[PDB]
Structures are given as C-alpha cells and as structure tokens.
C-alpha cells in the first residue's frame, strides 16, 4: 500500500472502488473507531499515570552548607536524567508501536477482502484488487459487508481468467 | 478469528472440528507450551531483575533541621514518583505485548494449517477452513499431527467446487 | 535446501533477508537489498537512540561528611542506592524488551518477503510449507528475477502451469 487517501475524509482506514457506475471512497467505521479509541487511550494513560505531589524546590542553604547544597544538586540532576531518558525512550517506543498498529489494521482489512475474492479477482500487489467480473455498487458493498457471494460470480470470473489465452 | 473456546480446557491454542461423525476441541500442545514458557519468563524477568538493597527509611531530623528533612522528603517523593510511573507503564505496555503475542501465535497456528491443505480447503474468514472433501476423524488428526496427506484427497477436492 | 521456517542460510553471506533459487541453469542465493538495508538502518537507529538519549552532567560523587554527620551520609546513601536501583532495572528491562522487539522485527520482515512471493505465484507454484515454492512451469533466470522484482507475469505461464497441475493422478 503506497500511501494514504487525501480524498478519504470520513475515517482512518477504508476502501476505494471504481466501476462502470463511477468511483468513490468509503471508510470502514468499525476498525477506525477502535483505532481512534486505542490511540486516545494510549495518550491518556501516558498522561494520567503520572502522579505529582506538592513541593517547594528552592535553594535555601548558606555558604557554609555547600556540601548539603551539592547533595541536593546531585539529587535534582539525578531525577532530571531519569525522567528525561524514560520520557524520550517511552515516546520513541510507543511511536514505533502506534505506527505498526496502523500497519496491522490496514493489513487485516486487506486480508478480509482477499479471503472473499479468492480467484475472482487479481491481487495487483499495491493494496488493490482487479475484478475478473463486473462488480456493481451492490457487489462492492457486499465486499465491505463481508457478505460477498463468491459462487455467484465464479463462472463469469473463470471465463475472463482463461480468456487471456 | 473472533472469540475463545470455553469448551477447550487442555491448552491455550487449538482446534475445533465438525464432520459427519460429530464435533469437538483439541489443543495444540507444542505452541501452547512455548507460550506458557514465554509468559512465565516475562513475569519472572520483571520480578528477578529488581535488586533491593538494605536501607533504613526513618525520620531522624529535629525541629531546627527542617530544610534537611524537606530535602529527604523531595527525595522519597521523587523515587515514589519514578517507580510508580515506571511500574504502571511497564504493566500497561507488557500487557499489550502479551495479548498481541497470543494473537500472533494463533495466526502462526492458522498458517501451519493453511500451508498443509492448499486447494483442498476453502478459507473462511473466522479462522475456519471448509473442506472440499470428506475429512473424517483420522483425517482431522493428521491435520493436527502436521502430516496431512495432501495428494491423497487432492483429486476429490477439484470436484466439489464446480458442483 | 530448506526455507525460512527451518533455520537460516549459512550460504547467504550477501545480506540479511533474501532468496535461494534452483533451476536448469543452476542455483544460488540472492539477498533482497532493499529490506536488508532498511533493517540495518532501523537496528542501527535503535542502538543509537538508546545511547544518544542519555543526558549526563558533571558531578563529584565523593563522601565528605564527618563522624557526627552520619544521618546526612545515610541520606546520601539512600539516594545513591536509589538511583542505582532505578537505572539497573530500567537498563535491564529496556534491553530485554527491545531485544524481543528486534527479533520479532526480523521475523516480520521474512514473512513479508514470503507473502510478496506467494501473492504473485498463485496456483502457478506449490507452497511446499517450508518457505519454498515449487514451480509448475519452467522458471529461468529472467523469470526468477521478476519474482524478486515484483513484476512476475502470472498469465504468461498460467496455461503451462495448469497442464502440469493434473499429472500425479494421471
Ligand atoms: C450489505 O450489502 C449487500 C449487497 O449485496 C446488501 O444486500 C443487498 O441489498 C439490496 C438492497 O438493499 C437488495 O436488493 C438485496 O437483498 C441484496 N443484494 C443482493 C444481490 O443479494 C445488504 O443489505 C447490506 N447489508 C445490510 C446490513 O443491509
Ligand atoms: C497421527 O495421526 C494419524 C491419523 O491421521 C495417524 O495415522 C498417525 O499414526 C499419527 N502420526 C504418527 C507419526 O504416529
């Protein structure tokens, strides 16, 4: 799958079809909503799990108390280093996960289509299927539904498949 | 592949079949054991990698040493915040991974079956294969064994499709 | 000669992921250079971010409290021990976690390479079930290249493939 549909506005993952009647985009609302809910939950947990207490970070040691002030410096610097590393790596790690999540969702959508069409359509290798029969707007809907009737078009599909000969 | 078998008790991942003789569950013991070993290892590493040394957390500063007591408070609170966040996020993260691990294992089990019976089965979308030939209890066992004899049923298979 | 799902090619010195073919003209290994380079770049980036994101400042860790300042020395001990525990756990778990991810990454890349082939050679070749495809037609060195390219012309060999598909029976 090469890139994304700027023309598809209504969702995150979906379909594009073209036939004799015309062409258009249609979003898969189920998988889109699950993905939006998951990603929102990810961002929220990363925010909500932080538990911050009250504190008064202010330096109140005198010039004959510099060993204690240094002890405080080591501590403040220590926590800055811990949080910086953990925050940075958490972001890098969860970003990798989020992008793979989207990849995984598109693939599942592609396989749900593939397993219906079998040899009634040619996998073009770019996320698109070329049909071996005439697939109208009702036929296209059934492919999104998960109700595509394979035997109904299988004969017609078999003629055009060996018509290449 | 939607939903788990309450009827399948003997393992974690497995098979359900239905034929003329009846229907029933059977667990895949190889992939189940790998999954149990991995998950147990995950829990153990999360426990074992912690090293807690001895210490005496006790407050022993007087009423003219409150700046030092506050310094200790900032420290104790600091570590409580670090451990709380890391523990919480570690759990949430590894739980996501554990559930995807199971998903991944089921898919591998499904592919092992798919590659063993090419044109002999009709892939449905729910993790299920509809056979194009009559597959009895012996035939079903061989699919679990990993020694399903494809050529033996291959001819019969090409007939039910055009019926 | 096996496939991916029963070990690696010691004979493929070329790259990380790739192909092995055998036909009448001969046999050999061929690395997929695109996916190999992406994997090397990703893994190198992983190692570099894990190193580069660390931010270390100057400090003079030395114990300079006297024998009537042991409560303060203990406060320092709790702190030093605290950070040692935090870094140890995080470092250990980061390594274990990212190693799992790295190995699954490689697994995933090999599977993608296998599927790109499978979806081209539909019923023109037999999935042997060990990462290898047995062709039902004569596939020469140009034919093999096209399978790696992603340009394999299925209709061109489909008829020949259908003739041989019905032999074992009669
Ligand atoms: C999913 O789309 C399918 C497309 O086949 C719908 O079924 C068709 O509906 C049309 C008009 O609504 C009817 O003429 C037929 O009953 C169906 N067509 C065929 C060829 O059988 C189906 O209604 C859609 N899903 C839902 C839940 O409505
Ligand atoms: C596995 O089950 C089959 C039944 O199809 C049986 O014939 C065979 O003996 C079993 N395999 C082995 C190696 O014993």
Author numbering:
A (entry chain B): 10 to 174
B (entry chain F): 10 to 172
C (entry chain D): 6 to 175
From the paper:
Influenza A viruses infect both avian and mammalian species through binding of HA to sialic acid (Neu5Ac) moieties on the surface of host cells, and viral host specificity is determined by both viral HA structure and the type of host receptor. Herein, we report the antigenic properties, receptor-binding specificities, and crystal structures of hemagglutinins of three different H5N1 clades responsible for recent fatal human infections in geographically distinct areas: A/Egypt/N03072/2010 (Egypt10, clade 2.2.1), A/Hubei/1/2010 (Hubei10, clade 2.3.2.1) and A/Anhui/1/2005 (Anhui05, clade 2.3.4). The overall structures of the three H5 HAs are similar to that of Viet04, comprising a trimer of HA0 protomers, each with a globular head containing the receptor-binding site (RBS), a vestigial esterase domain, and a membrane-proximal domain with its distinctive, central helical stalk and HA1/HA2 cleavage site. Highly conserved residues (Tyr91, Trp149, His179, and Tyr191) formed the base of the sialic acid binding pocket, surrounded by three highly-conserved structural elements: a 190-helix, a 220-loop, and a 130-loop.
Ala133 (present in Hubei10) has been reported to enhance recognition of Neu5Ac-α2-6-Gal, and the adjacent Ala134Val substitution (also present Egypt10) was found to reduce preferential recognition of Neu5Ac-α2-3-Gal to levels equivalent to Neu5Ac-α2-6-Gal. An increase in Neu5Ac-α2-6 binding has been associated with Lys189Arg (present in both Hubei10 and Egypt10), and the deletion of Leu129 coupled with the substitution Ile151Thr (present in Egypt10), has been shown to increase viral binding to Neu5Ac-α2-6-Gal and infection in the airway epithelia of humans. Asp94Asn (present in Anhui05, Egypt10, Hubei10) and Met227Ile (present in Hubei10) are both located at a distance from the RBS and have been implicated in enhanced receptor specificity for α2–6 sialosides and enhanced viral infectivity of Viet04 in mammalian cells. The substitution Asn154Asp, which results in loss of this carbohydrate among clade 2.2.1 and 2.3.2.1 viruses, leaves the proximal residues exposed and potentially subject to selective immune pressure, thereby enhancing antigenic diversity among Egypt10 and Hubei10. Anhui05 and Hubei10 displayed more straight-forward two-way patterns wherein 8-fold or greater reduction in cross-reactivity was measured. Binding to human α2–6 receptors was minimal for all 4 recHAs tested; however, a weak binding to α2–6 sialylated N, N-diacetyllactosediamine (LacDiNAc) (glycan #56) was observed for Viet04 and Hubei10, while additional weak binding to α2–6 biantennary glycans (#42–45) was observed for Hubei10, with some minimal interaction observed for Viet04, Egypt10 and Anhui05.
